[PDB]
Design a binder for these strands. Structure first.
Ligand SMILES: O=c1ccn([C@@H]2O[C@H](COP(=O)(O)OP(=O)(O)OP(=O)(O)O)[C@@H](O)[C@H]2O)c(=O)[nH]1
Ligand SMILES: [Mg+2]
Ligand SMILES: [Mg+2]
Ligand SMILES: [Zn+2]
Ligand SMILES: [Zn+2]
Lengths: 114, 49, 196, 43, 83, 65, 138, 263, 559, 159, 133, 168
RNA sequence: AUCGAGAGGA
């Protein structure tokens, strides 16, 4: 009766973005980026791949409320080097390792019987 | 599975809950603080079968 | 509730992913706080969950029979020859992070009861509406979409905060605010009010 | 259904008690909590 | 009968009950478009506006505190120390 | 109340294994432990969705209408 | 055949009863984890088996002897608000309100007394997977 | 190869057990959590009951049908109902089914999924064949009929993911374990007398070394080497199950970079 | 008594309550469909019309919608109904009865209302799902578990009435107790067991989690503090990152019985300026105790400060516990082998030393003490004699619980449970009693048919030598029940006595209010007290202060 | 018994003293006794302690007794309250019961007295004895449905 | 912003008291009779046996929130292994002169006694601890 | 020694000795006239009641009295210049701030205590039975000795339960 | 809807 519809987990609504951008009001060269319609499959893999980059001062996320599936990401970087670029450049590192798994899996799968 | 016992009345089932009571025809001895006139009472409830 | 006076309602539902899982990938149906455990004493709930496991592995229906020769150290010798650890525990991974949970969890099968009383059958709200004729007070219970009683004991807590206009309100503009005509001498409701 | 059919109501020194002669005739724990507790007992 | 301008031995402090009420009586006035005095710094809650109107003691209304025997003691929100 | 499709905990198909259950339990005679195992049920989450099940439809079927 | 008498509370007064109809009768090394039992040699008649001090709702409880008794009572007042299958017949029975579990299951631990309470045939809950743990704090 | 090193040891039609070398954990856990939910499947989603004379109430049966296994390999070349342009459902978005069995026999008339009928044009692609694993060939008991009971049906099966209802999960059960011997010491053991005689030795100990007695704790060593076994319901054979994980993962790992290029 | 001092009222809701760790203390988890229904008469000002015409359009469905619009002449305009519901021109000075927005004042109570603290104003966060949702640390003054306790909500209609809630009844204002002069709300359960787990000197966290925790506290100044450790691997201490919630300007000194300014056993509690030196935070500090942090931070600016604090502590302990975990097994009630041997002989002597004092009155002489007379008598003598056979074993089974034992944790923290809770669970449940005396003789001169008449020994009047782990024996069992039963007795009945006791106390004292001259009076003008509490001083603002002019030497005084 | 006593040297050292415990009350004649301290003597009977020692002794006895009930095994109420209670009982002259008999007579407003235990018969005599009602109490204006002189109700607001 | 103390010490007792990680260490000073030391050392991270001698340099440098490394390589260690940052609090006394400090590395405490006094021991917030070999 | 007393000096003491953190081992700057003719003047203007007539001014003192005895005992010159070593500026603060903490700890005229004088009182008793239980034994006290002893108290109990006499 | 009965939840 008050249960919210099941699809409100990936179906983005009207006048809603899949990324939001505001800087942190306190620490400079730092941004809080608001992902929408997403859980810590994207909240987790993104932070722990923001850590390999030494050019990145800060990296964290929080599931704000189990009720609305949306996490916020806080990032702080080295003077002059954009945070938006920090993310952009970190995402492709994932992709690359992922498109690595596709190949490596099938190469080994094909060699198995049954 | 219905093992029954209920009386079917007006189209709903009714059940009889065992009523309780102090047994009859037994002589019992009662006190009964004294202030108060009396101090001791022998009592028997009495009814036929 | 379970079979042991273990009443407590759902507090959330986490999909199989956000759910803590096991070394084999067993998802729990059911998560209670280990805080409604000692309070509270109910050591049986524990043992039920310890026996019911073995039974689900060995195939054999377990004997949870009351005054009998069955021991925690008798189940433990069996759950130990079944590839789990003797007192029910299991190593678990946090679903949000796939990081091991630093403390082992107590995990297994406990027969659970669904009692009546579901929010959607209790949930009630009224803001104005149908009232009686005797008192012009809101009618009783959700069945005739009525209010709630602001009883004596309630009245007490209010004076306690000294909320003074709040006790004009919750006893005038939310119950009765009838309006009559008093006589300046013979202070009684008899005056004929020919209006407007 | 079972446990309603074998119910025992008592009208009105120490009545709500579980007493020694209750042993294995009335149920030691089967009783309606609050209201009229200890009065009504099941067999 | 009325106690004069002097001889004032109440608490010279705004009782929380005077507070809630004076805030309340004004929070009515604000909510029903009646003149607003302080520079409304882009706030629109008739509750929070009075909260500023009490910071800058600009509220016209005088609490008349009564004493058991009857005869009373005045004091205005401008005279009273908010705390 | 009719063996469930799959099992709430894991999710593995269980519906197809009730049929072979009775047959393994009764036709050539074995104990339950071996039953769930040859049926392929190794996880007890899923072992329980059969052992604990009672097929009430059976006695619903005994009715004329 | 003179093997079992009927005893009410009045006659019960002048009798001796053994528990545990074996315990408690034979002639006179031991497991430490097992429970602690006390011990007259002038018995009149034996108790059949302890559990039969319980009623219906109680005899539904696994190990009520390991359970703080006030709770055993709570469990009983709640056993009657359980959800299951009251009769096979319902799907033509016209009675105000009725609840039926989508997919019931027998329990896994079972008090012997269930067999006569036909419980393993008309259950009231599900043998779900239980995780006693702190997590979200919900 | 380049990064992640995947070594398979045991695999079949329904069970793929493998290692997964040289990855940080945040991938491993994101992987399964896409393998669970975010992979799409087809399964019943609009049932229209024409006639039911079974003891089983109407939406109860309807429910069970959702859960029933459905072939979904060519599922990618099927649009979503939301993302399709027709009205309710079409043949480029929804595979429609039908179910008919009638009590003609005195002695128990079983319904199965084998008794499901493909009604819509299949476009000739491989999609919407109810899965049979049954030794005999009768995939899963749907229902039971008696002497004179009918069940007349019309199913619409749609695309969907395990976030929207656990029927759409080509999931099953995901086995997960890193670090059998606690060398990383992410977890501290509950013991009574000893740990090694009170906790079991894990299947995953052959091909992972014993840490030795007098070797001081390794502080900075990280999460490498995870031991997984992925089970299939059957809608997607095991190989594709895992691939599509990676895929959908990347697919939405991309869908942000793209929407970032939108700002 | 039922229709003038206990009226039926409009604008009210009722539901099951559930826990939310991510709500804030002064908040209330109103379910959507209630807030679809509960109105608040608001007049239209040039301030609000922008939000308000936009509301009418949203209708009695879209959450921030509204029903009814009241006009000038007094005509009522239904909004689900009517044919002009899709527009309407808003004039100045019209009522626009509206749903409830987020952050509105509402009185949220629970029966039995046995306080003032049972009735508190709250902030409104309209939530999906149908449960009333609340802060885990606003549990204690209401008295409310989520086993399905049903709670209640009321909504003001004047703006003055509003103020009256948020300015008096507002949850934060009621944090410190004007009844027990100590803060009634505190960190409770998961947050309370884990805070302990966090602050263990032993407990470390690092980067990957550290950083996330900083992002958790909302008031974070974007300043990572410097990790107490920068050796081979940079760690933070559990204590460390906790300080981030501890606001800058707060100070705490404790000293327990074993506390050296070293705290070898990490005892006591030293906090400096919102940073933690040493100790382990538990119910004495983070708990609703007297000298506890919550008391401190509420008297040192301010209430709401303290209020936000609460919510922060949780959020971080919650996030830590989440990933570290905790449960409780049967193993946690298991006692070491050669120690439940040392308990059975601890009964075995305490029993055999009742057998001494039993053969005495059987002797008979006796030396039967002066009063202590008797019969009172030897029937008091055995009562302690086993109440000591229990409470010795209860301690013998505390030393066994090594620091991993999941139960002790919840006692070391005091989350829930204690000594007697441990004792009954591992040693023996003890001598049960009825009306203060060990089980009374029902049958003539005997307790049961399984005993012989006349047996004043323990296994015979209601003593249970076994634990709950071992399972009681029938004999024992039955008695325990009889006992238990007496508890569920006063639950419905003896409660009445006390509840009635109040209904008088309340009705008697009542209009005794401190008048405008600090002289406590009734309705007549009769003084009752000349300066309230004989010092004209509010309880809420008082603390356990130590007059160190009394104690000490005449010479320790001089120097 | 044990008793903290000022030692001539300065510190408080424990002075263990024989004290006597008695089932019985006859204060009147017991304190007159040769040998016992008639400054420290104390029966739990606060009813007789009142008739013997005047009203002010009673005041402190009734308190001490409520205390010994509430604040025994840990429990704590801040003086003010117990005190306040104690006081209300004490001032009318003797000991006034916290029941219908006592304070429900004490010349107070009628309607307020109507809202307790005896009900009708209270209004009956109110109608009989021609009683005038103050209208100053809590319950008076609750029944009449008004902002009663309570907390936010003490003062009226002007300009 | 200069190195502050340093002294050679020797372990007299290692007491694993209700803790697996982080021990307590009792140490007597080398050369300087008038001096004793008690400190909490993370034994898991840095093994300490009985009768092992150490190296204990203090210093106060080698708002600004905490960066990670970025190596650079902003100096300080390599030849100092065990490091901890903390805060000073109450200062002691027992002869006159001497005199003793209390340190708090986020819970892991320290007690050092001995009369050099110092005066290049400030009352201040800063406080490191560097331990090599 | 330990008693309910308003305004925590003990803390305003640690609030002084870390705000302006002196700290040592470096000597103060308040003359004996600053400390002493300070406390004894604060003692004038703490105020519980106000007036101007004799009776009020004496019932005033006879209410502060206790507080002062503590104030006097912790703001004493030896202490103020040995254990705590305050400065002119910091003491003038401890001076202003106690006064400030004090006239906040006033009972507000308005306060309805009669009610609050229950239920407090009627609460624990109610909830310290009604609890009710937990669990088994003994369990009172409390409660059984007890709450029916309480009943006695409020009734004017002529037929006393247990009449016990205690002689010294 | 009114009066009356019972059962159950905290
Ligand atoms: O007859 C009753 C019984 C109980 N109550 C109220 O409900 C509560 C009953 O107890 P709770 O259910 O609140 O907690 P508990 O731990 O005492 O019991 P369980 O959760 O195990 O069931 C009591 O604390 C009291 O506030 C009543 O108002 N009346
Ligand atoms: Mg509860
Ligand atoms: Mg409850
Ligand atoms: Zn399963
Ligand atoms: Zn379509």
């Amino acid at each position: 009766m008050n249960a919210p519809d099941r699809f409100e987990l990936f179906l983005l609504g009207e006048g809603e973005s899949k990324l939001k951008i505001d800087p942190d009001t306190k620490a400079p060269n730092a941004v809080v980026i608001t992902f929408e319609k997403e859980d810590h499959t994207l909240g987790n893999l993104i932070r722990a791949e923001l850590l390999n980059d030494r050019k990145v001062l800060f990296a964290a996320y929080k599931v704000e409320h189990p009720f609305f599936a949306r996490f916020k990401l806080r990032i702080q970087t080295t003077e002059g080097y954009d945070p938006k670029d920090a993310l952009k450049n970190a995402c492709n590192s994932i992709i690359n390792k992922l498109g690595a798994l596709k190949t490596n899996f099938e190469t080994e799968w094909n060699l198995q019987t049954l | 599975f219905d093992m029954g016992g209920y009386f079917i009345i007006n189209g709903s089932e009714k059940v009889l809950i065992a009523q309780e009571r102090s047994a009859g025809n037994i002589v019992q001895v009662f006190k009964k603080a004294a202030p108060s006139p009396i101090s001791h009472v022998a009592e028997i409830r009495s009814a036929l079968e | 509730a379970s079979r042991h006076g273990q009443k407590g309602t759902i507090g959330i539902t986490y999909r199989r992913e956000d759910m803590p899982f096991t070394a084999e990938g067993i998802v729990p149906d059911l998560i209670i706080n280990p805080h409604a455990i000692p309070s509270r004493m109910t050591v049986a709930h524990l043992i039920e969950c310890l026996l019911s496991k073995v039974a689900a592995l060995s195939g054999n229906e377990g004997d949870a029979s009351p005054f009998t020769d069955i021991t925690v150290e008798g189940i433990s010798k069996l759950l130990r020859e079944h590839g789990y650890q003797s007192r029910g525990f299991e190593v678990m991974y946090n679903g949000h992070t796939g990081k091991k949970l630093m403390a082992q969890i107590f995990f297994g099968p406990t027969y659970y009861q669904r009692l009546r009383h579901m929010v959607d059958d209790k949930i009630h709200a009224r803001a104005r509406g149908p009232m009686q004729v005797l008192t012009r007070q809101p009618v009783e219970g959700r069945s005739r979409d009525g209010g709630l009683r602001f009883g004596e004991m309630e009245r007490d807590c209010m004076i306690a905060h000294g909320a003074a206009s709040f006790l004009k309100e919750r006893l005038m503009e939310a119950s009765d605010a009838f309006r009559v005509h008093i006589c300046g001498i013979c202070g009684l409701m008899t005056v004929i009010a020919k209006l407007n | 259904t079972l446990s309603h059919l074998r119910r025992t109501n008592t009208p009105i020194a120490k009545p709500r008690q579980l007493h020694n002669t209750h042993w294995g005739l009335v149920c030691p724990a089967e009783t309606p909590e609050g209201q009229a507790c200890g009065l009504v007992k099941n067999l | 009968k009325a106690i004069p301008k002097d001889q004032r031995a109440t608490t010279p402090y705004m009782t929380k009950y005077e507070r809630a009420r004076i805030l309340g009586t004004r929070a009515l006035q604000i909510s029903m478009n009646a003149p607003v005095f302080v520079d409304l710094e882009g706030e629109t809650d008739p509750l929070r506006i009075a909260m500023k109107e009490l910071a800058e003691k600009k509220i016209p209304l005088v609490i008349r505190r009564y004493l058991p025997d009857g005869s009373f003691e005045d004091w205005s929100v401008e005279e009273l120390i908010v705390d | 109340m009719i063996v469930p499709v799959r099992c709430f905990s894991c999710g593995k198909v269980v519906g197809d294994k009730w049929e072979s259950y009775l047959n393994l339990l009764q036709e050539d005679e074995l104990d339950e432990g071996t039953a769930l195992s040859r049926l392929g049920l190794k996880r007890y989450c899923c072992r329980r969705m059969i052992l604990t099940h009672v097929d009430l439809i059976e006695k619903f079927l005994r009715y004329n209408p | 055949e003179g093997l079992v008498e009927y005893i009410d509370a009045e006659e019960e007064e002048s009798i001796l009863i053994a528990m545990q109809p074996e315990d408690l009768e034979p002639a006179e090394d031991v497991d430490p984890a097992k429970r602690i039992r006390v011990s007259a040699t002038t018995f009149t008649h034996c108790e059949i088996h302890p559990s039969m001090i319980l009623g219906v709702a109680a005899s539904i409880i696994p190990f009520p002897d390991h359970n703080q008794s006030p709770r055993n009572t709570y469990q009983s007042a709640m056993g009657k608000q359980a959800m299951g299958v009251f009769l096979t017949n319902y799907n033509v029975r016209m009675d105000t309100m009725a609840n039926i579990l989508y997919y019931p299951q027998k329990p896994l631990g079972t008090t012997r007394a269930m067999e006569y309470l036909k419980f393993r045939e008309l259950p009231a809950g599900q043998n779900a997977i239980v995780a006693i743990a702190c997590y979200s704090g919900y | 190869e380049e990064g992640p090193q995947v070594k398979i040891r045991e695999a079949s039609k329904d069970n793929v057990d493998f290692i997964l070398s040289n990855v940080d954990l945040a991938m491993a856990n994101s992987l399964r959590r896409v393998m669970i939910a975010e992979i799409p499947t087809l399964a019943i989603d609009s049932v229209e009951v024409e006639t039911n004379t079974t003891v089983l109430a109407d939406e109860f049966i309807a429910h069970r049908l959702g859960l029933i296994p459905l072939q979904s390999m060519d599922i990618e070349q099927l649009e979503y109902s939301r993302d399709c342009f027709c009205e309710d459902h079409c043949d480029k978005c929804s595979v429609v089914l039908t179910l008919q069995a009638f009590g003609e026999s005195e002695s128990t008339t079983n319904v199965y999924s084998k008794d499901l009928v493909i009604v819509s044009n299949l476009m000739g692609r491989n999609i919407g064949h109810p899965i049979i694993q049954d030794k005999e060939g009768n995939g899963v008991l749907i229902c039971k009929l008696r002497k004179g009971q009918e069940l007349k049906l019309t199913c619409v099966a749609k695309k969907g993911i395990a976030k929207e209802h656990a029927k759409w999960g080509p999931a099953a059960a995901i086995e997960f374990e890193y670090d059998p011997w606690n060398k990383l010491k992410h977890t501290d053991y509950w013991y009574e007398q000893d740990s090694a005689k009170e906790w079991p030795q894990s299947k995953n100990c052959e091909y992972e070394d014993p840490p030795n007695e007098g070797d001081p704790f390794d502080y900075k060593a990280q999460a490498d080497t995870f031991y997984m076994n992925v089970e299939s319901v059957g809608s997607i054979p095991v190989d594709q199950v895992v691939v599509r994980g990676i895929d959908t993962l990347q697919k939405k790992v991309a869908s942000i970079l793209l929407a970032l290029t939108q700002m | 008594r039922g229709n003038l001092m206990g009226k039926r009222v409009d604008f009210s809701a009722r539901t099951v309550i559930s826990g939310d760790p991510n709500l804030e203390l002064d908040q209330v988890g109103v379910p959507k469909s209630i807030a679809k229904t509960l109105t608040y008469p608001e007049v239209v000002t040039p301030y609000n019309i922008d939000r308000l015409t936009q509301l009418v359009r949203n209708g009695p469905n879209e959450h921030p919608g509204a029903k009814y619009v009241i006009r000038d002449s007094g005509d009522r305009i239904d909004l689900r109904y009517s044919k002009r519901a899709g527009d309407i021109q808003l004039q100045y000075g019209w009522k626009v009865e509206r749903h409830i927005m987020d952050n509105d004042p509402v009185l949220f109570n629970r029966q039995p209302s046995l306080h003032k603290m049972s009735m508190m104003a709250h902030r409104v966060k309209v939530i999906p799902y149908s449960t009333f949702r609340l802060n885990l640390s606003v549990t204690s003054p209401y008295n409310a578990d989520f086993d399905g306790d049903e709670m209640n909500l009321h909504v003001p209609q004047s703006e003055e009435t509003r103020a009256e809630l948020s300015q008096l009844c507002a949850v934060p204002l009621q944090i410190v107790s004007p009844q027990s002069n100590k803060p009634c709300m505190g960190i409770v359960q998961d947050t309370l067991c884990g805070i302990r787990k966090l602050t263990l000197r032993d407990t470390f966290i690092e980067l990957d989690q550290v950083l996330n925790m900083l992002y958790w506290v909302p008031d974070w100044d974007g300043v990572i503090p410097t990790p107490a450790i920068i050796k081979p691997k940079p760690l933070w201490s559990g204590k460390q990152i906790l300080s981030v919630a501890i606001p800058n300007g707060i100070h705490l000194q404790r000293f327990d019985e074993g506390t050296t300014l070293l705290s070898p056993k990490d005892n006591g509690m030293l906090i400096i300026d919102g940073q933690i030196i040493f100790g382990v935070v538990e119910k004495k500090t983070v708990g609703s105790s007297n000298g506890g942090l919550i008391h401190v931070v509420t008297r040192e600016k301010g209430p709401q400060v303290c209020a936000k604090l609460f919510g922060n502590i949780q959020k971080v302990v919650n996030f830590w516990l989440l990933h570290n975990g905790f449960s409780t097994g049967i193993g946690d009630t298991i006692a070491d082998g050669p120690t439940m041997r040392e308990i059975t002989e601890t009964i075995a002597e305490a029993k055999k030393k009742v057998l001494d004092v039993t053969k005495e009155a059987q002797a008979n002489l006796l030396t039967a003490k002066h009063g202590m007379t008797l019969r009172e008598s030897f029937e008091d003598n055995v009562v302690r004699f086993l109440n000591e056979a229990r409470d010795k074993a209860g301690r013998l089974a505390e030393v066994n619980l090594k620091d991993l034992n999941n139960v002790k944790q919840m006692v070391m923290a005091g989350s829930k449970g204690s000594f007697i809770n441990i004792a009954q669970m591992s040693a023996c449940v003890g001598q049960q009693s009825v009306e203060g005396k060990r089980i009374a003789f029902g049958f003539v001169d005997r307790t049961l048919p399984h005993f012989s008449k006349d047996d004043y020994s323990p296994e015979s009047k209601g003593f249970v030598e076994n634990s709950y782990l071992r399972g009681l024996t029938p004999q024992e069992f039955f008695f325990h029940a009889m006992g238990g039963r007496e508890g569920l007795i006063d639950t419905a009945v003896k409660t009445a006595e006390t509840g009635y006791i109040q209904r008088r106390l309340v009705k008697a004292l009542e209009d005794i209010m401190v008048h405008y001259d600090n002289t406590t009076r009734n309705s007549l003008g009769n003084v009752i007290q000349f300066i309230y509490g004989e010092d004209g001083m509010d309880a809420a603002h008082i603390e356990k202060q130590s007059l160190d002019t009394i104690g000490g030497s005449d010479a320790a005084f001089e120097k | 018994y044990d008793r903290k006593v000022p030692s001539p040297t300065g510190e408080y050292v424990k002075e263990p003293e024989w004290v006597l415990e008695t089932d019985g009350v006859n204060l009147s004649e017991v304190m007159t006794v040769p040998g016992i301290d008639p400054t420290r003597i104390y029966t739990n009977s606060f009813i007789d302690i009142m008739e013997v020692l005047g009203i002010e002794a009673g005041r402190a006895a009734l308190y001490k007794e409520v205390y010994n009930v509430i604040a025994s095994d840990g429990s704590y109420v801040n003086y003010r309250h117990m005190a306040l209670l104690v006081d209300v009982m004490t001032t009318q002259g003797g000991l006034t019961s916290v029941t219908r008999h006592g304070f429900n007579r004490s010349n107070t407003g009628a309607l307020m007295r109507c809202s307790f235990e005896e009900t009708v018969e209270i209004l009956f005599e109110a109608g009989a004895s021609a009683e005038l009602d103050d209208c100053r109490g809590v319950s008076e204006n609750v029944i009449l449905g008004q902002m009663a002189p309570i907390g936010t109700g003490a003062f009226d607001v002007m300009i | 912003s200069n190195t502050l103390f340093d002294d050679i010490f020797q372990v007299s007792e290692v007491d694993p008291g209700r803790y697996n990680k982080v021990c307590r260490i009792e140490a007597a000073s080398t050369t300087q009779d008038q001096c004793k030391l008690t400190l909490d050392i993370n034994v898991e991270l840095f093994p300490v046996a009985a009768q092992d001698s150490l190296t204990v340099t203090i210093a106060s440098s080698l708002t600004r929130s905490w960066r990670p490394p970025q190596a650079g390589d902003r100096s300080l260690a390599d030849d100092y292994d065990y490091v901890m940052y903390g805060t000073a609090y109450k200062f002691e006394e027992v002869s006159k002169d001497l005199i003793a400090v209390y340190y708090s590395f986020g819970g892991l405490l320290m007690r050092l006694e001995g009369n050099y006094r110092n005066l290049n021991n400030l009352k201040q917030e800063n406080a490191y601890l560097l331990i090599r070999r | 020694a330990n008693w309910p007393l308003p305004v925590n000096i003990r803390r305003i003491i640690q609030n002084a000795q870390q705000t302006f953190h002196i700290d040592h081992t470096k000597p103060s700057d308040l003359t004996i006239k600053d400390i002493v003719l300070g406390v004894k003047d604060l003692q004038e203007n703490l105020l519980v009641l106000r007036g101007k007539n004799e009776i009020i001014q004496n019932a005033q003192r006879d209410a502060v009295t206790l507080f002062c005895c503590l104030l006097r005992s912790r703001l004493a010159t030896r202490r103020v210049l040995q254990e705590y070593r305050l400065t002119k500026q910091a003491f003038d603060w401890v001076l202003s701030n106690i006064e400030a903490q004090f006239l906040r700890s006033v009972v507000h005229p308005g306060e309805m205590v009669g009610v609050l004088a229950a239920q407090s009182i009627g609460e624990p008793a109610t909830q310290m039975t009604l609890n009710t239980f937990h669990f088994a034994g003994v369990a009172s006290k409390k409660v059984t000795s007890g709450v029916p002893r309480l009943k006695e108290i409020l009734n004017v109990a002529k037929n006393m339960k247990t009449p016990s006499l205690t002689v010294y």
